[PDB]
Nucleic acid binder design. Structure first.
Length: 496
RNA sequence: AAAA
């Protein structure tokens, strides 16, 4: 045989390149499988083993059950799982203090198994693989594309077994040892390993980022992946408010393992992907408001879909807050109430006020008797809608504007008892009652002014949608100015 | 009514 001749001359590098090319005859398979049993005495044999295994799994016409059983001595159950279970490739860097040029970002191919843990590399300690099996409760097969020392690959291998999809592992690497119960053990040469991983255009995850396998599974096998979007008015409060959002997120039991830096590292997110700064907004400028709304749509789209890593849109949880009540109303109209999101109200810190993860349309459910708001109405066309939930009373100027616009109707919504000091809590009942009064009394043409918390207007935007003919008037410090964007325009259609 |  051709490979038999190459094997007799120990030309493993020629065999590797011949395997990297997809030009292999079936008669060469018996000698190819036998190379997997050789001792890893030099890196050329180990790298030849890796390419052989990678070819059998990517080109399954070379994946033979008879050769798996007679050559590798695998039982029929392990041989099937090697044939049918998908493999995961995870990166991990190694630094040789004795030979700095021998350092490299290595790869590990992992296949989950049922009742057997083994490797094809002779330099690997079997007890170190048993520790991974005990920590993850998963048997596995692993092979490496390089010869190295130490146990710094254990976190990477555990990542390949816990992660459900490969995309989360395509742009990240790991380093660290794993204990028998899942706790991450520190390793050496973190700074050197980081320069190796970044030189390969990847991000390194060290024990300084992940402490146990439960925290690791929060990112690699997430149940509710929390992301952040905050709108603010001052740039100097950007980074500080991102950490305050992370603080309020960590208060939730479902997101106790959330870390801002880990979200940025695992999903290739930067600080600006999670905020929108508008220092001075001219609410009379239609085009200027359009850029802000477009930038909102682009950032939210990037957060809900990420870089294609997330496949189930229900897993993303958008922790959102805004800084301008008029701007938040339009943000909510575009956001809609089909995406799982949590709205936070900021006073001193971020306060969770509306949780749409269990019932997203709870801010839209009408009630027969109003418990949180008081309604004083005279329904005629056109209708002037006034919302009074904050400290400043807009009724006087709202009714002045009603007669300036020749509006014949009025719908005055204000807090039932107490005013400007809404108790911090589930604000979804207030929003549902405000939506009820608006939806039950809406006319052919409507105008709306509001003095309410920004989180209230944000939620109200999601409840209303873009179907209602409402003209919004923004209070420019002392006078109402018409927003040149009607609340039913086609540019406000929710794409989510 | 510009994180009320």
């Amino acid at each position: 045989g051709h490979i038999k001749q190459l094997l007799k001359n120990k030309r493993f590098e020629v065999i590797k390149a011949l395997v990297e090319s997809k030009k292999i005859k079936q008669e060469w398979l018996e000698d190819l499988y036998s190379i997997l049993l050789k001792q890893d005495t030099d890196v050329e044999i180990t790298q030849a083993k890796y390419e052989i295994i990678k070819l059998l799994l990517t080109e399954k016409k070379y994946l033979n059950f008879e050769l798996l059983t007679k050559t590798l001595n695998l039982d029929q159950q392990t041989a099937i799982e090697i044939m049918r279970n998908p493999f995961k490739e995870v990166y991990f860097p190694t630094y040789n203090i004795e030979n700095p040029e021998e350092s490299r970002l290595n790869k590990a191919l992992i296949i989950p198994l049922s009742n057997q843990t083994f490797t094809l590399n002779t330099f690997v300690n079997s007890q170190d693989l048993e520790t991974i099996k005990e920590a993850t409760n998963k048997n596995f097969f692993v092979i490496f594309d390089n010869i190295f020392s130490g146990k710094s690959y254990q976190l990477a291998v555990a990542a390949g077994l816990i992660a459900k999809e490969k995309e989360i592992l395509d742009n990240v690497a790991f380093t660290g040892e794993v204990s028998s119960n899942g706790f991450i053990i520190p390793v050496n040469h973190l700074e050197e390993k980081k320069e190796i991983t970044e030189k390969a255009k990847k991000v390194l995850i060290t024990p300084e980022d992940i402490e146990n396998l439960e925290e690791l599974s929060f990112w690699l096998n997430p149940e509710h992946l929390p992301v952040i979007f905050i709108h603010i008015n001052k740039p100097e409060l950007a980074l500080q408010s991102l950490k305050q959002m992370e603080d309020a997120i960590k208060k939730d039991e479902r997101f106790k393992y959330f870390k801002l830096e880990n979200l940025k590292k695992f999903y290739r997110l930067e600080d600006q992907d999670m905020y929108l700064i508008t220092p001075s907004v001219d609410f009379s400028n239609r085009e200027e408001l359009i850029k802000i709304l477009n930038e909102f749509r682009e950032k939210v789209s990037k957060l809900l879909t990420l870089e294609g890593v997330i496949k189930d849109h229900n897993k993303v949880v958008l922790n959102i807050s805004a800084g301008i009540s008029t701007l938040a109303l339009y943000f909510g109209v575009i956001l809609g109430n089909r995406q799982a999101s949590i709205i936070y109200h900021y006073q001193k810190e971020y306060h969770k006020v509306i949780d749409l993860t269990d019932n997203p349309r709870k801010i839209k459910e009408k009630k027969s008797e109003f418990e949180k708001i008081s309604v004083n109405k005279n329904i005629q066309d056109p209708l002037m809608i006034i919302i009074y939930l904050a400290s400043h009373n807009p009724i006087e100027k709202g009714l002045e504007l009603k007669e300036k616009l020749r509006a014949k109707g009025e719908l005055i919504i204000q807090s039932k008892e107490h005013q400007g000091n809404l108790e911090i809590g589930d604000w979804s009942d207030i929003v549902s009652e405000i939506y009820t009064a608006i939806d039950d009394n809406k006319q052919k043409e409507n105008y709306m002014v509001f003095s309410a918390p920004v989180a209230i207007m944000l939620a109200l935007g999601m409840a209303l949608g873009y179907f209602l003919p409402i003209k919004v008037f923004h209070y420019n410090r002392d006078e109402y100015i018409e927003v040149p964007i009607k609340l039913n325009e086609e540019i406000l259609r929710s794409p989510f």
